[PDB]
Design a binder for this molecule. Structure first.
Ligand code: SIA
Ligand code: CA
Ligand code: CA
Ligand code: CA
Ligand code: CA
Length: 753
C-alpha cells in the first residue's frame, strides 16, 4: 500500500490535506504551496513552532509493515534550520533521521540512537532538491538503511523506542526552527496480498513499452490442492496493475471459458512479455480433473495439453485461449537403449524379385546404434542413425564406408524424419529418401534373412530413438504396419503390445520402452523473449521460450518449448542431459529435473536453474536439490554445469522448492542477475521460510550472499524487473497467501559489500 503526497497546483489536490494528510502544527508553524522552476512544492514553515503532516495507520497496517518491511522516499530542499524529520513510528519504535543545515550551511543528517553526524552536501548543493530514501528490511534483527541521491549513507540503523504512531514529514520541533520545500513524499508498506490461499503457484511479468503495467498469475484452486484431484477444479487466474504493482484490477478467470463442466484442472501459468508487440503471452497446462503429473497418473490417451492466452497491453484486453497441444505434446513409441539393447523384429515373406518399399518416421533423441533394417531373403539393408561429436545427425549404411550427414542444425537433428527405402528389383538396389528427398542408393549385404527390424542394437552403445510409424509394402500390399502415433493415444482396450502384434522382442542388458509422452507442463514462473542471439547459430532474436516439464511415463525432465514466429507455432527442444546408473540389471538411479527457470546471459547463452526432485544421488555424486544448466544454441540443447548447484547460493534452503531467476538492467547499461528462494529458518536448513535474494555479477559463475526479503513463511516465488531501479516479487507466504514486494534493487545492491 502507498501513502503519499505529490505537490501540485491542481485545485482538487493543492494541499497535503486534500491528499489525506493531517495538519499538525503548533504556535506559528504553517505551510504554503510554492512555485519555483515551474515545479510546485509544499513549503513547510516551522519558524516559531512545529509544522508537520501526519498519516495514521490501522493496527493491522503497522503490523504488516513490521512483518514485511517498508520504504519511505522524499524529494525535498532544505531552506534553513533543522529538525527536518521525515519518518515512520509504530506503537513501539521508530527509525528517525534528523536532517538539518549546520552553522556553516552544510546539509547534514543525524540518527536518533547514534552519535555524530554525516555531511550530505556543501555549498549551493546544500540548499537544492535531493532524493532521500529509508528502507526497512524485516528479520530477526530488523534494521534500516538510509540513501542520499541513490547512495548508501548509513546501514544497519537500529530502531529506537518511541510511543509515537504515525507517518510524519516536515519540521517536527516547536523550539527548533526549520523550513523545507517538498515535491513528493511516498511511504510504502510491503506485502499486500494479491491472491489468497488455497490458490497457489505465482508468476509475474511487467511491460517495458508501457511502464507501470504489470500482470500477475496464479492457480485458482477450488477445493485446494495440486491438479489431478477429484476434490478440486483448478483454473488460471490473473490480475493487472497499471501503476507499477500498487493497485490491481479484478481477479480474472482465464480458463473457466474452456472448462464449462469442470472436467479439467489447469495449472502452471508461464507468462512471457514480448516488447515487439507489447503483449503478454501466458502458457498453461490442461489436465483431466482426476489425473495429472503427481504419481505419474496422467496417461497419453488423457486430455493433458498446453494452451495460451494473449494480453494486449495497450488496450488492456485479453484474447481467448488457443490450443497448441498437437505441436508440443509428442505421441510415439520410445526405446531407451541406455545400458542395453532393445530391438523389434517381424519376419516377412518379401520377394526379392520384385520392388518393395518401407517407411519409418523416426526421431533420434541421443546416442548411436539406432537402426531400421529390411532384409528380403537376398540382401539386408540397414540404416544406423547417430548423433556425431558436432551434435549433427548422421546416417551410416551397411557396406558403405563414408557416413552421411543428414542435418547439422540442432533443431532438425532431433526432430522426426521420414526414412523411406525403395528397393528396385530391376536395378538390384535400394534408394534412401528422407522427407521425400533422394539421399543415396546402395546394395546392402548378402543375407538369407527376411524381415523388418528397428530399435537400439548395441548394449555397449547408448542410444534412444522414438518412432511414430513403420510400414512395409510390396506390390500394393502392406505386409507390416505399426502406427505408434495412433496407438499411443488410444485407451487400454486397444492392443498396443508389439509382442502381441506380430513382433519379436530381442533385448539384452537394461533398457526401457514406452508409448508417447504422458504429459507436458509449462512449469512455474515466467518465460523470456530472446534479444542477444545475433551470434547464436540456429537461434534468432525475438524467440519466445520457457523451460517445460515433460513426463515420458515414469520420469520427469525439462525441455524448452519455444516459438520463432511470435507465438503462433511452437516447437520443443531436447531434454536436459542427466547421469544414470544401473545398480545392477535392475535398479535405475538418475535425476528428475522439474520446476525450472531460465535467463539469457549477455553473450546469448541461456542459464537455466532447475529443481531436482526425488533421487538426487547418482554414482556417488550428490547433485543437491537444485542444478544449473547452460545452452549455447538458443535453448535447443543443454549441458549440466559441473559444481554449479545449490552450493553456489550461500544459505539457501536445503528443501526442494520452486525458485525464480531474472535479468536486471540499470540505466547506465550495466546488468546482473537476481535469484529468489527460501533461506529456511535457521538459514541453510530445510524449510519454506524467509525468502532471500541473491545477486550474480559474473554471469552466473558466483552469487553474492542473500539479502533477506521476508521474515516468516516463504515458498514459491517469482521476480521480474519493474523499471530501472526496482524489481517486483510475488511470493507465497502464510497459508500460501501470495504477496507483492517492490524492491529498490539499485539500493539493496549496496548492502552486499
Ligand atoms: C521528531 C519528534 O519526535 N518531534 C517531537 C518534538 C521533539 O521531541 C522535540 O522538538 C525535541 O527534539 O517534541 C514535540 O513535543 C514538539 O516539539 O512538537 C512533538 C514532536 O513530535
Ligand atoms: Ca467452474
Ligand atoms: Ca481436479
Ligand atoms: Ca520458478
Ligand atoms: Ca515417477
Amino acid at each position: 500500500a502507498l501513502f503519499d503526497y505529490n505537490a501540485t497546483g491542481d485545485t482538487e489536490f493543492d494541499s497535503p490535506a486534500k491528499q489525506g494528510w493531517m495538519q499538525d502544527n503548533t504556535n506559528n508553524g504553517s505551510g504554503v504551496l510554492t512555485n519555483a522552476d515551474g515545479m510546485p512544492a509544499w513549503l513547510v514553515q516551522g519558524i516559531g513552532g512545529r509544522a508537520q503532516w501526519t498519516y495514521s495507520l490501522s493496527t493491522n497496517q503497522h503490523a504488516q509493515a513490521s512483518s514485511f518491511g517498508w520504504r519511505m522516499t522524499t524529494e525535498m530542499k532544505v531552506l534553513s534550520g533543522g529538525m527536518i524529520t521525515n519518518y515512520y513510528a509504530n506503537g513501539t519504535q521508530r527509525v528517525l533521521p534528523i536532517i538539518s543545515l549546520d552553522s556553516s550551511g552544510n546539509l547534514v543528517v543525524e540518527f536518533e540512537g547514534q552519535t555524530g553526524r554525516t555531511v550530505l552536501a556543501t555549498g549551493t548543493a546544500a540548499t537544492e532538491y535531493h532524493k532521500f530514501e529509508l528502507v526497512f528490511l524485516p528479520g530477526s534483527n530488523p534494521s534500516a538503511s538510509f540513501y542520499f541521491d541513490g547512495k548508501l549513507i548509513r546501514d544497519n540503523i537500529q530502531p529506537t523506542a518511541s510511543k509515537q504512531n504515525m507517518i510524519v514529514w516536515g519540521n517536527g520541533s516547536s523550539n527548533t526552527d526549520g523550513v523545507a520545500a517538498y515535491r513528493d513524499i511516498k511511504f510504502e508498506i510491503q506485502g499486500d496480498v494479491i491472491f489468497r490461499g488455497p490458490d497457489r503457484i505465482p508468476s509475474i511479468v511487467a511491460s517495458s513499452v508501457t511502464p507501470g503495467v504489470v500482470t500477475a498469475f496464479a492457480e485458482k484452486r477450488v477445493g485446494g490442492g495440486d491438479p489431478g484431484a477429484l476434490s478440486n477444479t483448478n483454473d488460471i487466474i490473473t490480475r493487472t496493475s497499471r501503476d507499477g504493482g500498487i493497485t490491481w484490477d479484478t481477479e480474472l478467470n482465464l480458463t473457466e471459458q474452456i472448462n464449462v463442466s469442470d472436467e479439467f484442472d489447469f495449472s502452471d501459468p508461464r507468462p512471457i512479455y514480448d516488447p515487439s508487440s507489447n503483449t503478454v503471452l501466458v502458457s498453461y497446462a490442461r489436465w483431466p480433473t482426476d489425473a495429472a503429473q503427481n504419481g505419474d497418473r496422467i496417461k497419453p490417451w488423457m486430455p493433458n495439453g498446453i494452451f495460451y492466452s494473449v494480453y494486449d497491453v495497450a488496450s488492456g484486453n485479453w484474447q481467448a485461449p488457443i490450443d497448441v497441444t498437437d505441436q508440443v505434446k509428442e505421441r510415439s513409441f520410445q526405446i531407451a537403449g541406455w545400458g542395453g539393447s532393445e530391438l523389434y523384429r517381424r519376419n516377412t515373406s518379401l520377394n526379392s524379385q520384385q520392388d518393395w518399399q518401407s517407411n519409418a518416421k523416426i526421431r533420434i533423441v541421443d546416442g548411436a546404434a539406432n537402426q531400421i533394417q529390411v532384409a528380403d531373403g537376398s540382401r539386408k539393408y540397414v540404416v544406423t542413425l547417430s548423433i556425431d561429436e558436432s551434435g549433427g545427425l548422421v546416417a551410416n549404411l551397411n557396406g558403405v564406408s563414408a557416413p552421411i550427414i543428414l542435418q547439422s542444425e540442432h533443431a532438425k537433428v532431433h526432430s522426426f524424419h521420414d526414412y523411406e527405402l525403395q528397393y528396385s528389383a530391376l536395378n538390384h538396389t535400394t534408394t534412401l529418401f528422407v522427407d521425400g528427398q533422394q539421399i543415396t542408393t546402395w546394395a546392402g549385404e548378402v543375407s538369407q534373412e527376411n524381415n523388418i527390424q528397428f530399435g537400439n542394437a548395441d548394449a555397449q552403445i547408448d542410444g534412444r530413438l522414438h518412432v511414430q510409424k513403420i510400414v512395409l509394402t510390396q506390390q500394393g500390399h502392406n505386409l507390416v504396419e505399426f502406427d505408434a502415433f495412433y496407438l499411443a493415444q488410444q485407451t487400454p482396450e486397444v492392443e498396443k503390445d508389439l509382442e502381441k502384434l506380430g513382433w519379436t522382442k530381442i533385448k539384452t542388458g537394461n533398457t526401457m520402452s514406452l508409448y508417447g509422452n504422458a504429459s507436458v507442463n509449462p512449469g512455474p514462473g515466467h518465460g523470456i523473449t530472446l534479444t542477444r542471439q545475433q551470434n547464436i547459430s540456429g537461434s534468432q532474436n525475438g524467440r519466445l521460450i520457457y523451460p517445460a516439464i515433460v513426463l515420458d511415463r515414469f520420469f520427469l525432465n525439462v525441455m524448452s518449448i519455444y516459438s520463432d514466429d511470435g507465438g503462433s507455432n511452437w516447437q520443443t527442444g531436447s531434454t536436459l542431459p542427466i547421469p544414470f546408473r544401473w545398480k545392477s540389471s535392475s535398479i535405475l538411479e538418475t535425476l528428475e529435473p522439474s520446476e525450472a527457470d531460465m535467463v539469457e546471459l549477455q553473450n546469448g547463452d541461456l542459464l537455466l536453474t532447475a529443481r531436482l526432485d526425488f533421487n538426487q544421488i547418482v554414482n556417488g555424486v550428490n547433485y543437491s536439490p537444485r542444478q544449473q544448466f547452460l545452452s549455447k544454441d538458443g535453448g535447443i540443447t543443454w549441458s549440466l554445469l559441473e559444481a554449479n548447484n545449490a552450493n553456489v547460493f550461500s544459505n539457501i534452503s536445503t528443501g526442494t522448492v520452486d525458485a525464480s531467476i531474472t535479468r536486471f538492467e540499470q540505466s547506465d547499461g550495466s546488468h546482473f542477475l537476481l535469484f529468489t528462494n527460501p533461506q529456511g529458518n535457521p538459514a541453510g536448513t530445510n524449510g519454506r521460510q524467509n525468502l532471500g535474494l541473491w545477486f550474480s555479477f559474473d554471469e552466473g559463475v558466483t552469487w553474492k550472499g542473500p539479502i533477506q526479503l521476508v521474515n516468516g513463511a516463504s515458498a514459491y516465488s517469482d521476480i521480474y524487473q519493474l523499471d530501472s531501479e526496482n524489481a517486483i516479487v510475488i511470493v507465497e507466504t502464510d497459508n500460501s497467501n501470495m504477496r507483492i514486494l517492490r524492491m529498490p534493487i539499485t539500493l539493496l545492491k549496496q548492502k552486499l559489500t
